[model samples]
Target chain A: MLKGKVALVTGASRGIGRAIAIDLAKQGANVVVNYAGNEQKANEVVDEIKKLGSDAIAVRADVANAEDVTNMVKQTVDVFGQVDILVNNAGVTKDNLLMRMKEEEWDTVINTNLKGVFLCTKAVSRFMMRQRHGRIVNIASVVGVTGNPGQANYVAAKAGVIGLTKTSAKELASRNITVNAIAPGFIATDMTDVLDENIKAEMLKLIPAAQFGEAQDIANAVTFFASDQSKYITGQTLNVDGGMVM
Target chain B: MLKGKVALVTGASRGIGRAIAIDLAKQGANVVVNYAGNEQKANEVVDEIKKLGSDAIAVRADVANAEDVTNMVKQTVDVFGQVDILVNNAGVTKDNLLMRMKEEEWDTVINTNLKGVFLCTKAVSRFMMRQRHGRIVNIASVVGVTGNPGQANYVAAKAGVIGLTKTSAKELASRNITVNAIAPGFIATDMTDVLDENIKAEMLKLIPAAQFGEAQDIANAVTFFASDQSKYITGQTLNVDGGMVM
Candidate 1:
């Protein structure tokens, strides 16, 4: 469905972002593997896409840096023609209770997680608007809907992403562009490995399906949003959380 | 899935509420149709359910009246032995711009939509708590989340419904009771037939799916929340719009 299209996935160096990029490529979209750091991993993802007989590019861009984002989109368009999809999957968490959370940490989380979405979307939206067609998928978290004990900054940023998706979708719905989001819960990622086992099991019990979601779960949802089947699905957040956050 | 269980639907006198009662009956649940008025319409719906070979009874209850709701639950117990699922769907709308919206309009909407949910849930929760299982689905609206220009009263009532769902879900999670809401957008109903054709068409264009939903669309989503499939889900609102409000 995405043939002759280009998808730029930020933080594609690892985990969920990598899976998203590969999934888009498998759906016949020219993949742009974007990484803020770890160029080697980004290159490996690009190579994997190439082995699948698809075009791909590895680009370095810190989403929080305006200049880097501009160049990333410019390079992507220059190589893959017009960019059809922009996936804002790059985010860093500064987990702390609200009282003890540092001002710098809070600022960093909002800047990279929330504002980066706005910045990247704004930059690409101008290009997408010219063509009058595009899809923007923001990767939010389950914490955005159900707040966690700590990680106030992270939760707020994720919540803001949802708000942004709704606002932008309403504004851009008149055009041929659609904006949606995905909120994944407790995926089997490097992040989950760091959590205490007892806490993990307790959380698992809360899921009706009794399992953590795979990164591909998020990817599959994003693919649906990217497809023609979901053209009417703007300003929506499909919770890919094993029904945990339903 | 709901075989042998008794489900009660409030405001089943007409409209979406009527559709819900019939749908639940078809799904193998004995249904109690609670109507505030339009006794003839309520009987028609109850008759439809009986034709489907499911046990169904019509119970008259003014949901806004505290004592009436109490008696309604008692009658459910009297006929069905036990109420397994309770759906809060009784509501009335008095439309006016925010500035000119009278306190009477506001109070009536809130009392019927918001307080009615509270009263109905509280009435049936005792049996549910004892059984340690139940599903409570509240009908909200898209205006509640995004805010409408003229529907201050309706918006407030619907937003209050969402808040009540979350609070009740958290309070009852330990008892295995689930509370969730469905927000339908631009469905084809009597409420929408009043709109001008051009106006309705313009609104349809805003929805990416380019169509309005049906009562069955909302019923499908309600059934998901009512069944054990969503046992792990609570304290959430699902938008069943054709992606209009998202």
Candidate 2:
């Protein structure tokens, strides 16, 4: 697995990020649990990782901000000595029809979701390049590949993330750093927990596997990318959606 | 590496498929060189593979036909004792504008490209499923994701291959069979050697890496997907495109 590796996971306070951080720790990687605003929850995640016999620390920073992203990476390296894996999992959403979408909404989503990935990747790249070994896993949305009607901004941001994943992969491949993305379909998260049963049933029908994926499903995928099993892989996007977007 | 594994690669007479078949042989996989026609060229490929110190057989069959696909798989199993991997690299191009495209043009592209993938995959799955292990790699085009004008048919069929990769990955995961795809960007081949210098230069401007990929680059990727290194990966499409359409 990832024994003794140091993994930095953004948005590690909850949902997919939390699952990925925990899974990485469970697989023997010490984790940097990053959160935008949820300090208490992030600390809880650190506590859980500690109990799993892997050290962890909660670091708060908005990934969209360059200084924050740089500081977060610096903090991880200062505490853990090296960053072997970086998971760009932090993202935001402002769903609206193209005609109804606000300019701020578009900027907000893009800055946080798309630019955030760019910032984090750039910040950690120096160390990864120096080490000549690194794995970067990006979290994208299924709608990023298959454009959705009401999610113009979110989809565009995620699409940018996917594109950025490839560019980063190529730029860093000479140094043996691999970057890939996971475009998740409708997962049964807290975000989807509030969905109407009617909508849930409709979504289930669209999935070939006949179910909404669990957050743990994404966690398992992230851990795989963070491990040596995917050493030759880069510039790829894997869809873990129970066959929803295929 | 794919040591001792038996691999069947379609359209192995030349280009990407030939490179893949030889690379598999180099990695110690006995190969079934599947070709639509071109028996002479196909035998040359088998000869090259044999020289690499691995066994190989040339199997002539149209990948688009069910009977041909079935017989190809049977021949592979009879010779190698098992079909451990399948690469659906056989494809045709009939580029035309949507309005100018004829129905037969669409059918021809779809039959050999998209339908061919389905036929071969289904034909090999019985042996793979019984063995409880297999690796399927479908060659997709970059235009499949980023649609291009005047290539509606080619793009659509490649897109279908991507979708089929995901569905097949899900349906066959319980049997430990992994289905993935490699979407190649412009690669240097016999087809591209005839391109006008102006067009080649223009295409180079779109690539961040500022280079056309070699066939061996693609063969390297296919070997990775067909090996134990990507065992946890499925339902994935990797773009080996020198940073094009990122």
Candidate 3:
């Protein structure tokens, strides 16, 4: 469905972003792997996409930085000629109770998770508007809707992302641009692999599927949002958490 | 959150319906428990709500029937003076694969699940519009978003309910009325309790949350939608599926 499309995924060096970048590539999209740093990791992702017989490039940019986001989109348009899909997957967590969370923690998470999405989407909107075609998939979290106990900063940022998604969807709908969100539950990743067995068990008890989801689950959801099949769907958030958040 | 409000919940005779009816009463709302034929069960639900020290009544109505829906709203307005919240919770399912599904099955489910919501919402809109304030929460299901193989009719109906939700929300937003849906996953209702153990086990494996959610969990979500805190939210579906659909 994404054949000949140019896609960009922020924080694509690893984890869910990396999986989404590759999955889009698999669907014949020319993926731009946007990384905050770590050129080696971004290069590897680009190489993997190239191995799949699709065009790819590693673009370094802080999604939260307006100048960097502008440069990243400029590079994307310069290489791929147009941006058809933008995955706002760049995020960071500063988990702490609301009372104990520092201003820095809140600001940092909000800057990257919420403002970063705004910046990237704004930069891509101009090009997409001219073409009058685009798919914007924001990677939110289950905690966004169901607020977590400790991760106040992360939850606020993700919840803000959801709000932004709806507002953007409504704003961009007339231009044939669809905006949606994927709220992933507890997916297994290097970050979660270090959790204690007891904690994992407790978390498992909250999920009806009795299993942690994979990054591929999120990737599949992103693909659905990026495809023409979901053209009529806007201001929607699909959860891919193995029935965790339902 | 809904103190002094008048709430009408369809299908409030048993299971999730009964739970929601009582939960609203617990929050100091006058409740009209709309039931189809289950007079005794509906009265019991009403009695339980009365015990919560709030006004309560059981109004008989086949939500799929337009006249019944109109009369139900009339009764609500006649008794309570106004309707502040409308929960389109009445639904019936006839599960069958698409290839072999009977037209009768499809009609019954669609009429009850999809058309019922339309009728109820349309009936209540006049009162809500005049009041310039209301909350409409539709009870959807996980299968609505993620199609189930053997529940084509139910899935289509539920999915249609979601579409209606978004349309209604957009249409009604200017009036300060919020329309949202709660997509409950595997709630431990009497209906689900009758499933075969093997089937139950198989269902559990698909949910990241290994256990079925209690009816109260869904009620909690409905209450959230009905609250003042959610005033800014519209056209959203909160899945209380025990992490089943996340």
Candidate 4:
């Protein structure tokens, strides 16, 4: 269903972002894998996409920098002609209590997690509007909805992304573009792999399915929002969180 | 947490509506139970509240009629002095395929489901704004989030209610008034009792929890939202769909 489409997957060097880049490529979309680091891993993703008989190339650019994000879009369009979907999946957590959290930690998370979404989404708004079609999916977190005690900065940024998604949906609905969000729960990703086993077990208890979700779970939901099948749906956050919030 | 507050619940004669009314009363709220055509049922709910040592009364009104809704608010204030919470739960579904559905079916569903929410929210807005505090919980359907084939009109109205919840949340956030919605799935109620056995079996297959939810499942969630635990939350739609939508 996504044939002939060009998709941009940010933070595609590892984990959920990497899986999504490969998944979109397998679905026939020309994938542009954006990575901040890990050049070897990014190249592996590109090779995986190439193996699927789809097009892909690794683009190294930190989304936190406006100029880099601008070039990322420019490079994508220069290579693929026009971008059809942009997934704002690049984010990091600087976890600490609000009182103990350093100002720099807060700034880093907000810059990469929150402002990066605004920059990237703004970069492609005109192109999408001109084409009169697009899908913008923001990868928020379950903590964004159910605020966690230690990750205040990360929660605020992800939660703000949801608000941005809603506003963008209403603003661009006239142009037949849909903006949606996915709040993924605990997934088996490198980011989550560092958590204490007891904390991970406690998180699993909150998930009704009694296990962590796979990266493909989030990827599948992103595909649904990107495809025409979800045309009627807009300004909605689909929780791909194994019933964690339910 | 709701002590000393007054709440008005429409369609409180029975089922989920009545449960909310009593639950609020149990939390030391003065309850005004509004029922359309069942004085006996309405009185029964009020009596249950009295048993909990809370102030309670029954008011008669058709939520679909603007005048009746206005009068219902007036009567509640006459008896309780002021309103702090409003639960828009009065709705009827004229279920049929869109091709075979009548205009009356659409109007009835929209008027009671969607228009009733608008009318009651508008009527209570000024008072709640003056009080500078309030909680509005609208009882919507899981079908609103995930469309149902045979109930197009019903689905559209419920979807509209969710939209209204977000808009009203934004409009009233500065007033410290929180507006939210609850989308309940196949909760075991009198309505679902009428579903064919085969249909129920097929529906169960879709719900991963492998069972129906109780009316209290919804009431418990509403109670949580009504509590101070959700103070910072606004413009949110909580799906009590047994993980169906997730």
Maximum-TM-score candidate: 2
Any residue pairs clashing in model 2, and if so which?
A163-B246
Superpose all Cα atoms of candidate 2 onto the true structure and report the RMSD in Å to 1 decimal. 6.4
**What shift in Å separates residue A53 of candidate 3 from its native position after superposition?**
62
Error of 4 at A65 (Å): 29
DockQ for all models: 0.13, 0.12, 0.02, 0.02
Residue A8 in candidate 3 has what lDDT?
A: 92
Query: i-RMS, every candidate?
Result: 5.4, 5.3, 17.7, 14.9
Candidate 3's DockQ: 0.02
Model 1: lDDT of residue A224? 66
Off by over 4 Å in 1: A1-140, A144-182, A186-192, A195-234, A238-246, B190-193
1 or 4, greater by TM-score: 1
Span of ten consecutive residues with least summed lDDT in model 2 chain B: B187-196
Q: Is candidate 1 or candidate 2 better by TM-score?
A: 2
Task: Please give, for residues A156-205, the per-residue lDDT of candidate 4 as tens digits.
Answer: 99999988887787677667777888888778874454578887778767
Per-residue CA lDDT of model 3 for A89-134, tens digit only, reads 9999987788899999999999999999999999999998899889
Best by DockQ: 1
Taking the tens digit of each residue's C-alpha lDDT, what string does model 2 give over B152-229?
999999999999998898899778788999898888873554468887888888765566778887887788779865
Top candidate, metric lDDT: 2
lDDT of 2: 0.87
